[PDB]
Amino acid sequence: NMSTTAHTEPSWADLPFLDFTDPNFSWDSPEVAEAREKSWIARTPLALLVLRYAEADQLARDKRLISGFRGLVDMVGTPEGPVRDFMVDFLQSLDGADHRRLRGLATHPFTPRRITAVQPFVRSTVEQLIDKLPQGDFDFVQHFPHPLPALVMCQLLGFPLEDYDTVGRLSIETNLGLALSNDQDILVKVEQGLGRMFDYLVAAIEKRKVEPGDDLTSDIVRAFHDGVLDDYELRTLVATVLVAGYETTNHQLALAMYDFAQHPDQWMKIKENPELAPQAVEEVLRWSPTLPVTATRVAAEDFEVNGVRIPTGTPVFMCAHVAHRDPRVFADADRFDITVKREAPSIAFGGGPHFCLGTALARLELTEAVAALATRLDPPQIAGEITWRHELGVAGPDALPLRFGAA
Ligand code: HEM
Ligand SMILES: COc1ccc([C@](O)(c2cncnc2)C2CC2)cc1
Ligand SMILES: [Cl-]
Ligand SMILES: [Cl-]
Ligand SMILES: [Cl-]
């Protein structure tokens, strides 16, 4: 598909080739930096890959580039079932009128007022998790970046807080990163992963249809009562928020510690001036985004951008990780430095109408965590095997063993 298109497009002839599906591929490879230097966009086996900051934002907003997933499902050849249904009907797959309708129902808790309102819960959750941290070598994931976003997710969606372990486990086991797989045995455990999480969600939704609260599930239920969306759209929307809201926030917090394990001097600088936390979080998002590939799109028509023809059906992926090290935008881009007040933000949350719904909540959880950890604890250092997810498009430890302080 990408190979047949390449043989038909003269504007693709000088584009560098990057095989990110390869098991030994690194985003920090000198091959990748060369490709960005040579071209704003690269050829991959699955998609065109945008490597520069300016164009990554441009194309993430371009109306001629439809929001991905529907195109990737047909090309792979996913059979009809619970997996395909979710991958074609969930928020990231929709565009136009249906997208604005369904997204608008889940936008209220992410307004600047509601982020302020939920902030005390986030702060006290962080505080409590630090209080009960082990003194020696421990998995940072198990003891902090798993419980934190899980508890916040339970608070947001109106689940009992005691279910944070179950809720987080139900979010991981869905395995959306392996939903576009060609294998059947893989697609079966994705089907069963979704089913089990939907079993929890359906119970919580019908509970809200009789006794609603101040939570997000209650608000989407109000829209169901008003006939804005049906029952299928209800549980799909609540599922999307949940799955998206846990795993990447988890991984991002782990990546934050991994970064400061390499730069303990900068950790101490946050300890001195805790106000550096938001700037530090932005540097973590720039240097090590949990999603190195952010916005995924498919061309809905033949069009041209910056000298490159993009035919209908061509997948285009925005490579935020590489765009974050663009020297056209970032000074000393290949160095982790939290002390630099940067004009341009990270683009870790995509762009366009599909931009991360939980952007502000994600930044809140990251800031509250980094501020409190750096104030209260000594710099982290790695204490064993980091189990990186060998999954295409996602960066993050499944387990991060560490200690805070040498002694
Ligand atoms: C730091 C952790 C996070 C990162 C790096 C991240 C990143 C992203 C990215 C790159 C997208 C795609 C944007 C695009 O297509 O242009 C996205 C979409 C989305 N995110 Fe996140 N996200 C994070 C946390 C969260 C949280 C905490 C929530 C909910 C509380 C959330 C909910 C969503 C939803 C619902 C979408 C689909 C938006 C749509 O298609 O309308 N995410 N996220
Ligand atoms: C690698 O390109 C991707 C893949 C998956 C997503 C996703 O929407 C997400 C959103 N927010 C936080 N984490 C994950 C997954 C729920 C479907 C986004 C971009
Ligand atoms: Cl460059
Ligand atoms: Cl150039
Ligand atoms: Cl800068």
UniProtKB/Swiss-Prot annotation:
Domain of life where this protein originates: Bacteria
Reactions it catalyzes: luteothin + 4 reduced [2Fe-2S]-[ferredoxin] + 2 O2 + 4 H(+) = aureothin + 4 oxidized [2Fe-2S]-[ferredoxin] + 3 H2O
Residues binding heme b: H99, R103, R297, G351, H354, C356
UniProt xrefs under SUPFAM superfamilies: Cytochrome P450
Pfam families listed in its UniProt record: p450 (PF00067)
Cofactor: heme b
Gene3D superfamilies documented for this protein: Cytochrome P450
A GO term, aspect molecular function: oxidoreductase activity, acting on paired donors, with incorporation or reduction of molecular oxygen
EC number: 1.14.15.37
Xref: InterPro entries: Cyt_P450 (IPR001128), Cyt_P450_B (IPR002397), Cyt_P450_CS (IPR017972), Cyt_P450_sf (IPR036396)
Disrupted gene: phenotype observed: Inactivation of the gene yields a mutant that cannot produce aureothin. The mutant produces luteothin (also called deoxyaureothin), a metabolite that exhibits a significantly improved cytotoxicity against leukemia cells compared to aureothin.
Residues making up the signal peptide according to the UniProt record: none
Keyword terms: Antibiotic biosynthesis, Heme, Iron, Metal-binding, Monooxygenase, Oxidoreductase
UniProt pathway annotation: Antibiotic biosynthesis; Polyketide biosynthesis
GO biological process, alphabetically ordered: antibiotic biosynthetic process
CDD domains given in the database record: CYP_AurH-like
Family, similarity comment: Belongs to the cytochrome P450 family.
Domain characteristics, as noted in the entry: The hydroxylated intermediate probably changes its conformation in the binding site due to a sterical switch of the enzyme, thus allowing the second oxygenation-heterocyclization step.
Role: Bifunctional cytochrome P450 protein involved in the biosynthesis of the antibiotic aureothin, a nitroaryl polyketide metabolite with antifungal, cytotoxic and insecticidal activities. Catalyzes the hydroxylation of luteothin (also called deoxyaureothin), leading to the formation of the intermediate (7R)-7-hydroxydeoxyaureothin, followed by the formation of the aureothin tetrahydrofuran ring, the final step in the biosynthesis of aureothin.
Subunit structure: Monomer.
Protein name, entry field: Luteothin monooxygenase
Species for this entry: Streptomyces thioluteus
Gene: aurH
